Curated annotation (Swiss-Prot), chains C, G, K:
Record note on quaternary structure: Forms a homooligomeric, either hexameric or heptameric, ring-like structure which stacks co-axially with the proteasomal alpha-rings.
Keyword Cell membrane: no
Lineage, highest ranks first: Bacteria, Bacillati, Actinomycetota, Actinomycetes, Mycobacteriales
Protein's UniProt name: Bacterial proteasome activator
Similarity comment text for this entry: Belongs to the Bpa family.
Keywords, sorted A to Z: Proteasome
CC annotations in GO: peptidoglycan-based cell wall; plasma membrane; proteasome accessory complex
Parent-protein start and end of this portion: 37 to 145 of 174
UniProt record, GO biological process: positive regulation of proteasomal protein catabolic process; protein homooligomerization
From Swiss-Prot, chains D, H, L:
Record note on quaternary structure: Forms a homooligomeric, either hexameric or heptameric, ring-like structure which stacks co-axially with the proteasomal alpha-rings.
Protein name: Bacterial proteasome activator
Alphabetically ordered keywords of this record: Proteasome
Family, per entry: Belongs to the Bpa family.
Record field: transmembrane: none
Role description: Interacts with the core proteasome alpha-subunit (PrcA) through its C-terminal hydrophobic-tyrosine-X motif (HbYX motif). Interaction of Bpa with the proteasome stimulates proteasomal peptidase and casein degradation activity, which suggests Bpa could play a role in the removal of non-native or damaged proteins by influencing the conformation of the proteasome complex upon interaction. Can inhibit degradation of Pup-tagged substrates in vitro by competing with Mpa for association with the proteasome.
Molecular functions (GO terms): proteasome binding
Keyword Ribosomal protein on entry: no
GO cellular component labels: peptidoglycan-based cell wall; plasma membrane; proteasome accessory complex
Species assigned in the record: Mycobacterium tuberculosis (strain ATCC 25618 / H37Rv)
Lipid metabolism listed as a keyword: no
Biological process according to GO: positive regulation of proteasomal protein catabolic process; protein homooligomerization
Length: 107, 112, 109, 113, 107, 112, 109, 113, 107, 112, 109, 113
């Protein structure tokens, strides 16, 4: 559990990303909303980094490449980036949950 | 702590208001006036949440949210993103405070 | 502080009235006369709600709602936004007093 | 108490069920002129009968919330659906009110046991 | 229960009206069947009156206005009139049933 | 009483016959001959019911039902109304006699 | 008086035969030859039913049914009416003897 | 008794199941001439085999109820569906008959206990 | 049970026929597959005969007429022939099963 | 006996292979090469089954199955028939060996 | 003789890989590059399976499978056949060792 | 043992869940060029991270089974779906393997009781 330094924060950022991801698959987006959405992706990765152990900051950094800060990504590109985050986070927490369940069994 | 939400009832109330409005925007297309009104609601509702959260969460929410351009009317898409961001963030916030409360129930189950 | 809702029965019935109207607006398109009627109902029902709430929640509601422009007839969308705002805000209010009350039931249990 | 807010519960409940059934009927299919007049008049008389069965405070609350129809014009399907939908919701709330009352008596009258 | 003098009769007239109402919503009607149907509405209100206490005869009378006996009403008008009766009757009997249930609890 | 149906088996039998025929008319459109036949069935079936009911119900049913014009063929709609009237009236009649029978079962539950 | 149905097995199987044919007529349109065939079956099956019933129910059935005009071939509709009449009348007959018999089971219980 | 009305129950049941399955097959899709002839002949032989397995009274009842097909013409999908549907219903009733019989023995043979 | 001399064999031939019957109702067939299918019907009746008592060999023979060995039958004709077999077999086994169940009750 | 399947695991394995392939042919239309391959699979798979069955079943299966023409490519229909024949025959074969096994379980239930 | 599958974990994961790919081919049409890729995967995965099986089952598999013609790119259909062959053969293999193992569980019970 | 085939189970599981979610996303809707490049690169880096968390034998098995993408061309929706589908299936099998392992320990550690 020592991999996730602030579990509450990482959980809520993840829930935000998953909810936004549900929205992009809801309908096509226009220029401005995809602008907001690249920006939100940037800031939300920063917040996640704050809440993770160093090796995971660096793992996530190896797996994710940022968006062109001057260019507007497509619905597809946004959907890939956010789907990656959501999947990585859910795997992270099935990890900490098989751990917690292991402790439940130890006691 | 659960002490991060200084006024939990208020934050729950703003949150369900926003979730209900998001469901309405996903219900049918909107016109000029209703989009403008909905922008204004988004602004004041982030202000109320700020009132109801600990400083760390005021400044986190502030880092994650960008206000709308006050001279232009946002699109249906832009509004859905803004409010969806809020809704997801809040639902995560309360799965947090609920992991805390449930931990307390199990501690008191425990010492017996 | 369940003392935030001073007249719970009244607030509940106004809430059910507004919710039922919202379902009607989403049911079918409206004409001028019915949209004016519903505008008027929105105004008076906000006033009844104010009557039934503690001052701080009256003032919160006031910060959250802008009345309608009486120089125009609002669109179905604008009405749907206003009433949806009310409905969600009310349901959140009662999930609050409900988690509180159930907590008291546990205190007594 | 709160049950003394509704002076004649049997009457209020049956008027309410009448209005609910007609609301469902109006949403069932479009209406003609004659049906819209009958339905407006039913709306009027049913508000009067409902008034008869409520406490003064709810008589005047309902009055503050309801506006009569224009009698020189025949209202549209839209106005009628609004009028009756308002009634249905207001009554539904009224009875979750008295319903929380009766349940409250049930809880007191086991609490003493 | 003193409001409904002959409960069996009122129940069967009501079941007749409700069944006819289901039929009008089943398909559009022609002239002759709408003629029969206004007439049945008239006679069935008479029969109901026979089975109700005076104040309810008068209440129902205040709420219902008869059809033009020389003119043929539309499917819509018939459907309104009969829906009114059905709703009023069902409310009447949820009344007598909350009463009977109250007696069940008293004993 | 339950003594209002002098021959209960017979009335149940005419009733299910009529209900089955109503279901057939709602099944598909009819032609000249089948509408005529169905008119005749309606007539004789009201006569059989009269045989099986107490006088008060003979005369009530008579007040509620109008016979068909014997020289003209009724429409599909007119037939559905006539038979639907009968079916609803009968179903109400037997929820009556069943409220009686059930009352009897509870009385005998009771004195024990 | 379960003695109204003198041969219950026979009446039951004729009843199931007629019901199954009714389902076939509602299944698809028919031609002349099959509609004549079904007309003939209707006649003979009414005669077998008569054989299996008490006199008063034979005479009731007779009052309720008019035979087919043999100078024409009936339409699918006319056949459907006649057989539906039989089926409903039979099902009512057996809900009668069934409420009676179950009542006897209770008398013995 | 009533079970002695069906002299060979195994045979009657299997002929019956055969006819039921073909009825379902005919309603499955339209048929050609050759299939209609095979199916008419199956109808004939199956009535004869069925006769072999029933009491005389039911042999003659079935005969009063069934007419053979016209052998100089090939019957239509319609006539065949009628013929086999008649058989299926008649047999279904026959076995609710013997079924009420067996259940009757079950009730006697607990009644004495 | 003395009517079915080799129950395992008759059961598997029957399962084969039923499975093939499901296939013909699956899609229309071409010339060659209907050729194979008449032939399979012939040989499968032979195999069934091997597994049945004489009176049933003769009963089945009375009820079934073979295909023209030089002509190709239609999807419909094949479907009739195989549906007959399937139905006859299922009836045969509801027979032997009501028998076996009867023995279960005897003991 | 259950001793008619000399190698039961092998026959089950060939059988599920064939059933899976039948499901694929019913999934979508096939081209030249895939039909040819599937013909070859049918041939070798009957050979493997022969290896795994008692002589009586080798010769029965041989009486019931006709090989494909080795110079021509069978149609989608012809392949579905061939494999459906196999699948049905095998499923019947194992409801047989299962009626045997279940009989054994009941015998051992029995002598106790 | 559970000793027929020498490395059960490896055979199981290769099996799940192939099954998942089969679902992908049935999901949508493919282009040249992806059909060549899947051809290559089919070859190497047969080799890994061989590594994990007893000799007689290697040789059985070899009798049952013909490799792909590398002079052409196979069609979606041909790939679907080859992989379906593998999947069915594998599922049958494991229903075998599973009925055996469950039988042992009963021997010990 | 078999659980020692996966040296870092937490890491391998989360990389696997990441790849599964992206596979579902690609099948959700068609992709553009930029998305296909991001997705190819994600495929590369995720294979490297996955390697880090497996035993050498599975590192080299996975390598025998996977071919990198052509870096001078951008792969199609088809190639990407194949590549990631292969990964997903291979990992799913890997974990039913270690899953049968853990369950095996559960059975030994009641067997001695």
């Amino acid at each position: 559990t020592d991999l996730v330094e602030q579990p509450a924060k990482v959980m809520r950022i993840g829930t935000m990303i998953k909810q936004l991801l549900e929205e992009v698959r809801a309908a096509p987006l226009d220029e401005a909303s995809r602008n907001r959405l690249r920006d939100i992706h940037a800031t939300s990765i920063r917040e996640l980094e704050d809440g993770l152990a160093p090796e995971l900051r660096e793992e996530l950094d190896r797996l994710t490449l940022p968006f062109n800060e001057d260019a507007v990504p497509s619905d597809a590109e946004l959907r890939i980036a956010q789907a990656q985050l959501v999947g990585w986070l859910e795997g992270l927490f099935h990890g900490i949950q098989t751990a917690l369940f292991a402790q439940q069994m130890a006691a």
